[PDB]
Design a protein around this ligand. Structure first.
Ligand SMILES: [Cl-]
Ligand SMILES: [Cl-]
Ligand SMILES: [Mn+2]
Ligand SMILES: [Mn+2]
Ligand SMILES: [Mn+2]
Ligand SMILES: [Mn+2]
Ligand SMILES: [Mn+2]
Ligand SMILES: [Mn+2]
Lengths: 97, 93, 105, 83, 95, 103, 78, 97
DNA sequence: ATCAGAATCCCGGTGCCGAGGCCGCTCAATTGGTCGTAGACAGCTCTAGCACCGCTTAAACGCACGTACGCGCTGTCCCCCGCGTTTTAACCGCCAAGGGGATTACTCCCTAGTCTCCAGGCACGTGTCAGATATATACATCGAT
DNA sequence: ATCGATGTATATATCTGACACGTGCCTGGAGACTAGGGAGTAATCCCCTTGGCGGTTAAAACGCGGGGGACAGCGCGTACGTGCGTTTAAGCGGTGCTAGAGCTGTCTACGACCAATTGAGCGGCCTCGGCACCGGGATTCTGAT
């Protein structure tokens, strides 16, 4: 049969997801998560369906921006593979806590 | 009820600039935000300027210098000329 | 003409920009040229962007500007991009850019 | 009905797909959990704030606008949803 | 010789309230004043948007309150609100 | 006054003046200059607290900017708050990265 | 003139910075960096002066500039 | 005798983090400020507090910067800071492009 | 080198629903005239800033010399990618129920606004000590041996 | 570790400028008191949010095998740190001179406030043409032989 070499499908997928704009996290899991976190702040909250959608839009943008700057951190340490420690450096530098 | 929007003006200007081109519900919406963002941004920074200079009123001088702080060069420059033009025009008519 | 917009030779509603500036607690009082100026600056920018979005639309073969088109527009323009350096456009996606060291040799 | 463990709804493929739009080619295994941790600190901020606006507006329903205001607060301004 | 204001003297009075046998420098005093104005704007400004967002024309202790809850870290806010709700009721005692 | 009537040291009058003239809203409640003056008073105390502490710790009867910085940056909650403020003449906390230390 | 930002001075800052070992090209890099910083801060600053119709840039223009730029500074009349 | 390369380095770090005094001497700096401003507007005067404010703002900034720079050096298993760190530091801060 | 298949790129047809248009209704802007105070301008005032000068003194500099770090190479070990099959629950579009937002409607309370009277807060005054300055001693190192 | 050896901390004597505290004028706050409109509250409808179920399947999970990257070891060459003596301009203390900013009093141009008047702009409704979806076919290139 046939087998694409390692890193070949990665590069493909990058190009895929960089052409499109549709959300990457699944819609339903996402909602469940947001309801949880919010419940544990105040019980008995409802959401405008578009308000979930807002948080998701905002969440993905952030993580995609994140991966961006993480990825630069890997490439800084002459690596090609992203690692928690990379993420960590990006957040220290962004001045996140 | 009435939800006011820059949807007509944004259309107008689009039709002025790309006459055979439509805009989607979301895109319009986006546009609509952009106008509001820059409005506050300018408006607010003009408001600081009145305040800083013990002054009670926001005049286009304020709105102008607000623009010079807020916007990057080529954008700011054009915008300024663009704006002080409409003042002039508005005075005369 | 009646419309203050027309006196100003503008598309943006100078009356609306005047109402908002007052119901907005930026100052006691508002000049009469400040709305005009602002309404015009707002016009410049929506134009400056719609110009680039429509071009963005054209290349992607399209009659209708959808957010990807605004996004492409914004992050390709050094200057617009900086003005909106902290702004998520819903459905914007990202610019196609793949780092060198990840490319096969 | 009770809600538990939902962060694990953020499956590994997804956390992957995002990294690809992000221009990452090679993902270390210990990334997935960190990303979940991070997304959590993230939502715990936008919703701590969204919700405050909702409490202040004396409401039992969180609106697209409370979200959008929260984001703006934390310098993550979002276009597309009102504001 | 213009009469420019500050919070200097109240800072002191509060300094005495916490550290009776301790003093301050001019250079630190401005910092304490800068600090106060900065905090004032941020709370006031948040309060301001709150009103607007809610199609309402008045900045009350309630606005000022939630503003604080958006501007302050979990614990620091907690006390603030406390001290805030306290000083209010205590003031509405007297008249 | 009203500082008295609210047990506050911070000028409850001043504050009401500033809220009105500083263009935040059309109208301004009576509780608010009181609520806020208190929160300003609370926080100025928390800082003066740990800075003073710091001046004791650092063996001085008078607080200079440093003692503020030390108080602030060492406090997890206060350092956040002033996460974007450079304090004049504050210096930095001493931190010397591990792998830089001799073996 | 810019090059008046002495190597030793830059060395000191990096020491307060926690920095132990310094490459040679840093020094010049520091300089462009510092220049960019002042320019932006002074561009904003001056704009305030020009708008206050003054021939003398104040501290408050500076202070206002830093706020604009998210680099708030305390102790010059906040 | 002789101190082992990098041991006064550690000693100076200790010294400067203990002190709050400004590190660029006032007058070169002062002349740098006047130069940069003349480019924006002619025939100008600066309040002596205006220059101090600038100086405090600039130094604190650069120190902050060296901190974050130095972390990228370390991220690359290095110990010497290099222009390429600064670039990554500022890139991630979002200062530079 | 040559060959296969896998994925993407592109093609036409295709069926659906959103943007764009038309029509009519109402609310926010226009118009016009008053009245009052902000701001502008001119006239004087003194304060802050710029300038130039010269003394000792630290800081900048420049080179010297060697060491330890950066960087490039190599090799090993292993983890993370790809694929295929099993498994799980997202998504879709089905309806059913009522909580809650949003629109409405009336009374009155709280605050803005005016005035007149009263000390809290400010510039400015001095005398005083907390603390910058240090010189000799006490210690807590670092490097050589 | 143990050497003597730096350079650093700690000390206790004296000196000096900013602190802190008091003088007293004044301008912002406060008490009195009128006026009304923002918003509280209670009543009423009508969206959209939750919930709940199965038909469908695209996505997720899980294991398996090995390719190629993380990283550990090293080995060379040099780009920095250390540190003497060698060159500059930073700084301090002193006086001189004025541009410019600060304050003051006057007049009118301009902007809020108010009322009566109406099409700009909105929602509500309507239609079809841009484009999303299905399915077939040719173009590329990667990896196996
Ligand atoms: Cl005007
Ligand atoms: Cl109130
Ligand atoms: Mn829970
Ligand atoms: Mn071949
Ligand atoms: Mn109900
Ligand atoms: Mn030993
Ligand atoms: Mn109402
Ligand atoms: Mn003059």
């Amino acid at each position: 049969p046939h087998r694409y070499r390692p890193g070949t499908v990665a590069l493909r997928e990058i190009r895929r997801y960089q052409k499109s704009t549709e959300l990457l996290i699944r819609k339903l899991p996402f909602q469940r998560l947001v309801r949880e976190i919010a419940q544990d702040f105040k019980t008995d909250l409802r959401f405008q369906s578009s308000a979930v959608m807002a948080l998701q839009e905002a969440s993905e943008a952030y993580l995609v921006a994140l991966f961006e700057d993480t990825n630069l951190c890997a490439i800084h340490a002459k690596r090609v593979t992203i690692m928690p420690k990379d993420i960590q450096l990006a957040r220290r530098i962004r001045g996140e806590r | 009820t009435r939800k006011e929007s820059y949807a007509i003006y944004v259309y107008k200007v689009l039709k002025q600039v790309h006459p055979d081109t439509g805009i989607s519900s979301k895109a319009m919406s986006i546009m609509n935000s952009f106008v509001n963002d820059v409005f506050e941004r300018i408006a607010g920074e003009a408001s600081r300027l009145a305040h800083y200079n013990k002054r009670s009123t926001i005049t286009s001088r304020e709105i102008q210098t607000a623009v010079r702080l807020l916007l990057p060069g080529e954008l700011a420059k054009h915008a300024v000329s663009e704006g002080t033009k409409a003042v002039t025009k508005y005075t005369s008519a | 003409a009646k419309t203050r917009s027309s006196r100003a030779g503008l598309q943006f509603p100078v009356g609306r920009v005047h109402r908002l500036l007052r119901k907005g607690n930026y100052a006691e009082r508002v000049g009469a040229g400040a709305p005009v100026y602002l309404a015009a600056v707002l016009e410049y920018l929506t134009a400056e962007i719609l110009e680039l979005a429509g071009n963005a639309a054209r290349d992607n073969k399209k009659t209708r500007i959808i957010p990807r088109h605004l996004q492409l527009a914004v992050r390709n323009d050094e200057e617009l991009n900086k003005l909106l350096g902290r702004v998520t456009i819903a459905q914007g996606g990202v610019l196609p850019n793949i780092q060198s060291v990840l490319l096969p040799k | 009905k009770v809600l538990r463990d939902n962060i694990q709804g953020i499956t590994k493929p997804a956390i992957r797909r995002l990294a690809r739009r992000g221009g990452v080619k090679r993902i270390s295994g210990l990334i997935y959990e960190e990303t979940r941790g991070v997304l959590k600190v993230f939502l715990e901020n936008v919703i701590r704030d969204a919700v405050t606006y909702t409490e202040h507006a004396k409401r039992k329903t969180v609106t697209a606008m409370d979200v959008v205001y929260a984001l703006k607060r934390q310098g993550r301004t979002l276009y597309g949803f009102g504001g």
